[PDB]
Amino acid sequence: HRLGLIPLQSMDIEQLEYSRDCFCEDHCDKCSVVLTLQAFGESESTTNVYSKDLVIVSNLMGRNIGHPIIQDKEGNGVLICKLRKGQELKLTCVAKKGIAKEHAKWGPAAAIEFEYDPWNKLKHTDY
Amino acid sequence: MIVPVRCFSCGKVVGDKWESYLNLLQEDELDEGTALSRLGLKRYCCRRMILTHVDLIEKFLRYNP
Amino acid sequence: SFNQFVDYTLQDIICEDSTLIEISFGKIYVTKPMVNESDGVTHALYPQEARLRNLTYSSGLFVDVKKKVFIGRLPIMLRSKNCYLSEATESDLYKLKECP
Amino acid sequence: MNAPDRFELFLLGEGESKLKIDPDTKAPNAVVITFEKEDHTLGNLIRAELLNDRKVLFAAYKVEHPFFARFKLRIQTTEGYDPKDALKNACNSIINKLGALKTNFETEWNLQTL
Amino acid sequence: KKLMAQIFFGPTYYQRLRHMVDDKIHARARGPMQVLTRQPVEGRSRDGGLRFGEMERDCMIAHGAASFLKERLMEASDAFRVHICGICGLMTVIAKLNHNQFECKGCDNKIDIYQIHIPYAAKLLFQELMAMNITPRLYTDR
Amino acid sequence: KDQDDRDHFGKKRLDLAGPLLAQLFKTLFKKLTKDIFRYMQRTLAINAKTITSGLKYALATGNWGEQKKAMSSRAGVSQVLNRYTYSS
Amino acid sequence: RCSFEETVEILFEAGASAELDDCRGVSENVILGQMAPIGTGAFDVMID
């Protein structure tokens, strides 16, 4: 779930294709971006698993896409999980083009401020 | 459990802001309000998202299996 | 209430109300929670192991008989005197897979 | 469990056409058009742009049920004016305004810092 | 567009109770019956039916829907066919079917026999009464 | 002086695990020394299963007073620990 | 009457006195599982 919510690079998303449109089996490089995640507890301290640990695997063939957004100051990004001493997390993510109408994870924006007539001169609101 | 990746209400990413929040709390010895304000959490929904959260995974990691 | 029952009441029950005509009963000793396996081995039972294996977290009663003996097993209230979790630290509980 | 698929909000079903034009039997020279896989985002805009055309007598959209992504738009125009042309003019006007808005926002963005 | 009345708006601690629909939802169109009463079993997990209670019956009476009341109490639940002696009016009939041998030891009846449709629970009631030295004799004429 | 208030909480007692286990154990143990009296008069072989199975039964079924349905404590003296919420 | 309160004893004293049941009562046709003389069943339908 929280992997799904991770903000990925969607700049050249328009020259990517919907998996439902592509004539491939399941998914391919023309519709989806595959990135792996391999983390393991090493030190005695808690080993954090961020979004930077995600590694693009599929062939991007030039398109700026898939790279997890990191606006974090330290450069880590979204905190995905926390591992102990001998805890391992190994998985593979297949990212596809989607509309935020289908799931809020594909939401390109957050909060949009919107206000008209700050004096109630139209009288659309009875205070 | 663990800090929610994005805010429920709007959708702002607040998963990368947990550790920084803790640092602003203990390292700079600030109060919660100012710490939340510095992290760009102006709306009280996200402000809530971080302030209200309880990191339970730290207690879950106390087990060996 | 339970601790009062173990440390005081039990001895009263055994001593004050029982004598046959002879075999007089003496002091009552309450052990720590153990289990007599089908393997024959009797060993210390911890609450997590008791709940996982559908076992009964109980200790054994022992009475001195005159003219020693095992008379049965009493279920032990958790975090009581005759429980391992009473003198246990937080780290101990975390090692015993018991929530602090 | 009984919840419908998400893509059924924008992906057309089997045989379902995007627009269904129906001759309104109430008042003469009127029409009711069924928009499939669309919501208020399109309905409100088109309806509001139909009221700008002064040769349009009636224009109103409605979503009969929030469960389903579809809405009905009723249009009534003056005699000698086919309502489809009113819809087309409205649409083209919308597209033009949006294009101009895009160009304007771009030119305004090219003048900013930070 | 703006709303006329302004809205009371703010954070409030809500809790999610454990009564969820998919754990509650239930539907049955002819399922497993009980053995003693031959009626639909009790329970959602056992894929059972819902009790058409006494009050429901009273409502159907108040409406006047007699045929519906009969349907719920026969075709929907337990519907059974029994044979009745034309003499004593009891379920003594040894109805050897496929040979048309409708015997009745105790009245010597082989030609004056009847066939009725009753709920299996009614059959159970009548039998239990018969085992309790009581004869609920059933005649089919006024 | 008016009638005694029979709903006065001061003249009421709560019996917890202590007194309950006390009554139960008194019964089972008296039963034990009874059976041991029988084994003695028949003539070290002491059936410890009495106390164990008795306590376990009463704690499991919630029916205080061993296997006798005449018990008015059938209202579930011991119940399953509700663990849906910590507060619960 | 047996379909309310005192059930068994009613059946007993009815079995002793050998009572005749008219079977035009509602609960009686309910027991027998027949269409009771209620509203819809308060008459007969034939063909002419």
Add this chain to the structure above:
Amino acid sequence: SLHKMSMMAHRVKVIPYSTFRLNLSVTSPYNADFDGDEMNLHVPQSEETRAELSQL
């Protein structure tokens, strides 16, 4: 089912999601809110009995 209005014949409109959706103005004779309330639904098995439901 206190009175006869506790059992009424409705027309079926098959819908998504796992709830019995009813009209607001029918809340009163059933005496029901939606704070977890459950309702039952029976189905006729012949023409005459569904005629009974629809006409009575």
Add this chain to the structure above:
Amino acid sequence: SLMSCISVGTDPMPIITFLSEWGMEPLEDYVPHQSPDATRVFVNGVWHGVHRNPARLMETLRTLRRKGDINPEVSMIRDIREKELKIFTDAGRVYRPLFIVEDDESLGHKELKVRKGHIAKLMATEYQDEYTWSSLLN
């Protein structure tokens, strides 16, 4: 309720022995007509005799319980207008903790025995983790 506890139950015999050795007449040596205003003393619903000058006895017992010599669980009831004294050591009694108000304050009025110093010691024990609830009770 959050602070309610149930009485474990203790032995009433030392309390009896204390009563008899503190100016209490045996019930078998009671003559009502020559001492009508004598407070009768009850222990667990048992009349062990009467006692004159009940105030001193009551303050004594109270002081003992507040010190700890008598189990704090034990309840002591002084009924003035009925001239009775009921001491309960019964198990199953639901009790609750209360602040003690005594007018021993010289430079003032009726004040709480507990002071901000005690509270400071409590919070000191809290921050350090030697002064707990038992220290307040004793």
Add this chain to the structure above:
Amino acid sequence: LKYICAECSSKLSLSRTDAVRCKDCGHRILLKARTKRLVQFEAR
């Protein structure tokens, strides 16, 4: 098949007619290992 212990990190492969207990441990609590046939998750 194979099973892993509960209160220690091991990897027993004792099939049927073996069962309890563990290898160099002493406790009888045995968990079963994860399947090799991976399962997909719709990240939603």
Add this chain to the structure above:
Amino acid sequence: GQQYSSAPLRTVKEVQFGLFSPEEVRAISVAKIRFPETMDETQTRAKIGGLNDPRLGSIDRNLKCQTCQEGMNECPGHFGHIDLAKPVFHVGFIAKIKKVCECVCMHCGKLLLDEHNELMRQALAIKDSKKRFAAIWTLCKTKMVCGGCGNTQPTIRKDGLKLVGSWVLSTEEILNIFKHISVKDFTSLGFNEVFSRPEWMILTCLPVPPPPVRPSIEDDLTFKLADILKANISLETLEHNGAPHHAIEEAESLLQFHVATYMDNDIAGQPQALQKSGRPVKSIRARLKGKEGRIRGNLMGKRVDFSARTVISGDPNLELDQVGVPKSIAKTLTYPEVVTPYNIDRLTQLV
């Protein structure tokens, strides 16, 4: 459904209640019950010629059942019968019987007052059986002395499951008394000619309910019938062999006990006759007593098919006479529709 029968389909118009005459009981029965052993006999999955005969109804999902066959789904219950060593009391009639003995003196068998009496003319004038009996019982239980046969009628009181006399009544005695009341006296106190007689209230031989009444997954009724049979054979054993005085009477009262508690278990007598599991056991009387009883729980209201239940919610866009039905429920519940030329296409599509 089931199958085709040559018999015409009719409707129950009348229900004539009555008592079960031992004659008709043993005439109706198709199997005598000699052995208390249920099914298994010396490690054999069969049925001994005692209790639960295959004649009463087979119980193994077979295709045979007392030659009548028709499996076990069509064939109802075929009643049996068991003869008691001595006649016993029917519990539910204990009162009524005790009343009759007060309306008629001992040995003889005649009403205490006739048309010669003034008030008895008024008491016998009532046509209503219950009211007539109630009117006579109150004006006949005060008579001590007595047609002739002048004998001081004893004061009868109830004690457990027997009756006493003050100047202990035997069940055989009361049988012999009720056997001599004749027909004309029956009409005077409610009873009927061929349907219900006081000489049938007392249990000579009792009918045995078939396996479809007491199934096995053994039933409590089977255990109680085993108890009755055991007491009976024990009684016969203590009768045909060495028969002590103060030993067989206890066995008679034992058979009386088990038979009386076989039907009614919630009596004034504290012995509730528990079972092996400590259960108070389920009597026939308890099977019928509401609200979980047979009448109120299976007849007045019973579980039905083609039904559903769900959490409700409001919907402003539904018409008043509409109901939102979840898709799953819509697929579950079904309606039988006969193929007609009007709808054969639509039905073909649905199939």
Add this chain to the structure above:
Amino acid sequence: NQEDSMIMNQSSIDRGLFRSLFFRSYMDQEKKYGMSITETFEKPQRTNTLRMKHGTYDKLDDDGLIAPGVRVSGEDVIIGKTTPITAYHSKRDASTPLRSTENGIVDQVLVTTNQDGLKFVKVRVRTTKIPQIGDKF
């Protein structure tokens, strides 16, 4: 949202609002008789066992259990046990099916001996329940 009903933001729901985990344990045990008659844990085939379940057993392993990770649904068989009561059809079925109305993923499987030395098993199945129309708040 009339008559004590409420409207919930679906977007926030998609972001994990009020989601929950739901764990359920199914417990089974091998029986024992006086003459050493023991039920066994295995994956029985259609021909070797009576009755059987209408669900499939293809998710079971050699030991008659499910490997934790496999998604279960409908009336799948979680535990395979047989009780033996030459002759064809030599066993009775005693398998434990997944809850008819439930579904999800096998979280974790526990295999342990009893106090009397009886091999018994606790299987925990896990499902994520997401706030749907009809859920009580």
Add this chain to the structure above:
DNA sequence: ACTCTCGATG
């Protein structure tokens, strides 16, 4: 003296 839903133990 209303319908449901589970859980326990024989």
Add this chain to the structure above:
RNA sequence: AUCGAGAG
């Protein structure tokens, strides 16, 4: 079967 908890 009974018992216990919960839903309107």
